């Protein structure tokens, strides 16, 4: 459509950079992570797995170069996620491969900021037992870079959990959704690793 | 981010080596294998298959070249598993293709040591019968290079099995997890092959 | 710790390269230089020397070879500066040998990029006179490879000077810090040499 | 298709065993034999041969090794008969080589049990005379291992003969089909040999 | 590791040949096929499908060139199946895509002989009915090149079926496993096609 | 690509055989024929011709020789139809030369079986009259070897006609598609000839 | 194997043509379609989906060039389906992605004719209701090029449906299988599209 | 001929795969089956056997790997059926071994789809009685994987039967050809098996 | 003209290779496919066929040998398509043979990459109905190797569809052009086949 926009895409995609961390100076890359819990689709007592429909908000800043003098033009362009590098964030205890609800498209900004929000259905281990009871049940899943240590990737969160999107007539009510950031160590490695633990406590309406 | 780190990745990835065993001298490659049994998710009586959530610790040393004089820099870099060669270790009797819980990221070290730990959900043949009984039930699965003989790949293990990670409120209790290394022969080939037999004995709490 | 990381270090350090410029093709090595002026510790009227606490950001790309197929592993490793070749950048007019605040550690990246940032206390010639006056005083020191001509080493700078780190309650206020790159010639040699002139203008609060 | 299934085939086929009787302990191999008489296609008065369309149910247990821990996976795999050893059972008095209606595929089970059912058209000696008469005619053919004595192979049968499959509008009606097991001796050898004598008595409708 | 081995791989892989049948003279390629029935994992009455865990032994000779004078060196090398051409052998009546238990690795020999054994879980059509009965049930599946006629590919089998590997405590007992080679014709084509019919007869213990 | 595959093609193509029926023994060649009626594209009232988009499944077995010992290799290879002999099957009453939708490629199998499926648009004589009426209209076209008598070529069919592929929103609805095999005689020759009569009865939706 | 064959493959594959319709003159490509209904594996009342095991015979003629003078050589070569262009024929109402029973191999002939027959398991919408009743139930699925209009692709069928292959002891009996070609129009496009409607009427035995 | 084509064959044949079901994930292989009834060559009253000249269209998808970047090249290659795995589909009640009219060549496509169409002459049991009468006679033969259950192989059909190819002056007229898919169970096995029942009803002209 | 160029052509054409897939190692050939929809020339309501003027971008890599040391010379040479092997890609549902707008010339590169772009006019089945309406109409045609399965040929696409070339004053407006890659199975064959489905949705301006 717009020629101005067209040059933007081409310049960044063609000339700008291959998979590599563009930032030479000592700076780790921080990725903000937010969860919007859309719905708790199902619970399996025998399996002890629960399914969550979530969208993950991920934001990071990449270094981009401005070759052509930027003029008032197309500020944000949308591109497929494949085009650019994305973070490794994954659920530590997912029973199965997560499925993707939405297309992989990411908006990029001139400053270099990128916003990618996938929609996912994830199945993770959690005992459903006592969902019916008033107390309800609690489940926790931790998300975080598999490979990256705290040094390489720093995870940050704005708030606890986004309930607002939550479906009004979901099978299960949400007593409370929390996303607490924590740093933890593994026997594999001396480096600290940061993950966000999403603890959802819910019960049947 | 850090320019110093950036050169490291590029040098190893771009210039350093294609899929090939870099070691010319007569040295087999040893891969240490460790299992952290996260949880026994499910048992299927009709199917006679059991599902395990495990993460596999795999360590090996690859030969790398240091072109640029290494200065105090980024000691370990994380890269996707696709970038580098990984071992063939697979479960001998998996009913289905294993699924991958975590992203494929591997930490590499200047010495050339590489640590890759995938998280897996594996379904393997095992009769659930008498899980309820006090004696419990025993299952065994052997892991080992499919193609590689003992000559090419040597498998080593530090300890029996890592129970500590095991989920506290798992459906099944772990009576004992063992990883014994054994060498075995097949009618196909005169070469000895080494596999680690993971024998888990568990019962319902 | 991580075996994967361990191989990385060993491969680059042991096999990869001795002090030599790994780059055969006609390419000069560019080193980006940045100054973070931490503080102006002291001024000596009689001596006419001033002391600066700075950290120097230095980035360069070295050619590294990837022998073992890189897998997702330790992306950046940290090593002592002694291990790898570092640039000669020195202050042209330092009254005394600079002292080193921080350990000599440099992060290296797979791409081969290396980031080394030393912290230094440097004493250089500059007349303190009229520090008290509103106009303040100006000092200049030039940094650049002693031996290397522009051909061999090219110096680049991202920005003027990093004030942000500057101590809030420093004895002297910073009117402006600038790092301008300049190329200059010496009677010794017909080759052009590039240095970054750090001109700081400061006064007592 | 399924990776899990794929390993199964390969393991048994590649590594598991060559033509050899895997059973070291003193155990003869018993093969159950059953006949499903599909139809009596034709009778030749001059030739005195009769043609039967039958499928032979053959079951035996072979010893298999489970290397990889069996997980819930592909329980039964189908493979060509050529892949595994089959019994020698043949009709003692076949006028001509039997033809094979169906592909040679055999289902194998983890326990090691194998079920192979070929469909055959067999021509054997039998006088057609008096087919038209009410009494009808009787024919007998014996099936049994040619080489194997009772010691090596034991033959067993569940029932007399399977009439149900028999074509409704066959040229000849089945007065009675019987499969009696008998052990017999031959002048060649002192060992007893077991065969199943299939005696069919039929007449034209 | 060994340099000698390293050259071997590179020479065959890099220089030796693309997907093409290297044999110019009039020679069909024969592929020996063997089945090791690991276990009959499951039976589905409603589905009328049975699952087999098998490993398939496949052997063939490819023409290779020896450039460098072969010295006493690494006789057999292991490589991924993707690297070299493999035969099309597939189950004629598989309900679903077979899954692969083991990694795709194949051992190659200097003579050019190649041994590839995949482990598979295969689901094929077969009526489970009367498994409980003493007679048991019979199933047949035929394996053979889909495309290749007898002219192009010839299939051979050493023995009937490998029971030895069969799991001792499998859900189903193996009455007999057979692999008979047969040549058959299809209305599509005048050429004869060869397949191995694997007929397994099994029952519940 | 694969060297192993490469030899296969070359051996069969170069050495294996010229246009000639490779089968010396007394065996006619049977060709299975199946029709997948993709769509009835058009009807011409004046012309009284109808157009069918069909793909023809043709299978036959050719005798191939295996020179090089077949190892586990490329089971089925694809080659152009020109390379190998194909059957003469043609529509008896085609108004015009049939056009070919798909490339002429045929898969061949080691057993010698060949599967060739062309896609065709054929125009044949048939009165469209009363397509609109509820009764609809019937058309018949017979396919069969022009030259070959029943002795030389035998035609076989698995089923009546494959409706499933039929386009959902085709101009004409399919009341019933049948493929009945019939043998017929011509005054030219005393030999019986076999053809498959495809009778399609269709009407406008 | 045969050198003569080898050249054939290479010439057609390497030099002969990329995905493009080789036919410049005004000729549509006709693809004959035939269905061999192997078996009706299952019916799901709740789902209202039925599963069919079919093989599709597809034939088409592609234009090939004969560079080297063809001598008596390898007439038909087998190659992978990926190598050559195949038609888009798909089931209009498939509930799920079809699975492939057989390897994708296609036989090609010198004339350019290609025969490709895949084996498929397809799940399509159809109400099972009243399968038990004597009347039975009817299901219809239409196959045809998704994209191609009648102009581009013409579908033709030889016969109604191939019952012969149908499994003798299938769960469901086949009252009649028909493949009627029909041309239909869609609101999307003014062009006529041709599909083959496969209507199968079956009941439980 | 074409070098590009040549590499294709070699890569798939040599490197790509041995008889094994390449599909690890849980996918059954579906094979479409179509029958093109070329002609009903003969009927034998005494024998009660009928001969059909048919070609069988078989299509299946195999998993292939693309090593070399595919460029516009030879899309479909033809290879002998022996080269690749073919399905076991066989006539349940064939009186004699089917003969093959055509060479076993199969076209393969890059996507992996394979089309194999054999031409066959098949003799199956069927009473000729009352062929002369107006009502005619009906015969049924079922085709389907011998070994494979519905799970492993799924059969699908596009249409009823392809009459079009049917010879115009065949000895017998085709009243209707049908191919209905049905699933059936056998006492041997609890798994469902799918077959295509080809029911042809024909009479003398 | 240039002698240097002249040797290039001769060497590749004369000495380099016949139709054969030059790639011995296990590598499938991938062919990238792109469509540039030039114009929708016509729609035929009665015929239900639509005509597209497209050019097909096809790219693949062939293995070439460099005999003479390559010096700076003619990098890309143009040759007739007949000279080298081209892929089989064809439209599944083309009503008629496609015509060729442009000469068959292909550019080849030293790396072995080949780019061939034919211009075609294709007629495919599609209902024109409701072109006038605002909603417009949708048509789909699938392109893909006829013979080649996914194993042999892998198809890849860079983008959805190239609208830019589209004629400004075409009879029909393009609402959206998409090229989605899909893998599908056919009943003929167990192998997966990949095709690109071109779905164009257009309406009259």
Numbering used by the authors:
A (entry chain C), B (entry chain D), C (entry chain D), D (entry chain B), E (entry chain E), F (entry chain A), ...: 1 to 205
What's in the article?
We docked twelve copies of the homology-modeled BgAChBP1 pentamer into the 6-Å cryo-EM structure. Comparable results were obtained with the BgAChBP2 pentamer (not shown). In BgAChBP2, the putative disulfide bridge C16↔C64 is lacking, but residues D25, R63 and E70 are conserved. R2, R3, D26 are substituted for K2, K3, E26, but these isofunctional exchanges suggest the same role in inter-pentamer binding. Instead of phenylalanine F71, the single cysteine C71 is present in BgAChBP2. The only possibility for this covalent dimerization exists via C71↔C71, since the other four cysteines in BgAChBP2 form the canonical disulfide bridges in loop L7 and loop L10. In silico, we assembled a BgAChBP2 homo-dodecahedron, with three C71 in the center of each vertex (not shown). However, such a particle might not exist in vivo, because we could not produce it from recombinant BgAChBP2. Recombinant BgAChBP2 formed many pentamers, indicating that the protein refolding was successful, while rosette-like particles were completely absent. Alternatively, BgAChBP2 might exclusively form di-pentamers, with C71↔C71 bridges as covalent linkers.
Acetylcholine-binding proteins (AChBP) have been described in several gastropods and, more recently, also in an annelid. They are homo-pentamers and water soluble homologues of the extracellular, pentameric ligand-binding domain (LBD) of the membrane-bound nicotinic acetylcholine receptors (nAChR) that belong to the Cys-loop receptor superfamily. In AChBP, the pentameric quaternary structure and the overall subunit features of nAChR-LBD are fully conserved; this also includes the typical pocket-like active site at the five inter-subunit interfaces, with several strictly conserved aromatic residues for ligand binding, and a C-loop for controlled access to the active site. We retrieved full-length sequences of two distinct subunits (termed BgAChBP1 and BgAChBP2), encompassing 205 amino acids plus signal peptide and sharing 52% sequence identity. The resulting cryo-EM structure is a regular pentagonal dodecahedron ∼22 nm in diameter and assembled from twelve ring-like pentamers; each pentamer measures 7–8 nm in height and width and comprises a central channel that is ∼2 nm in diameter.
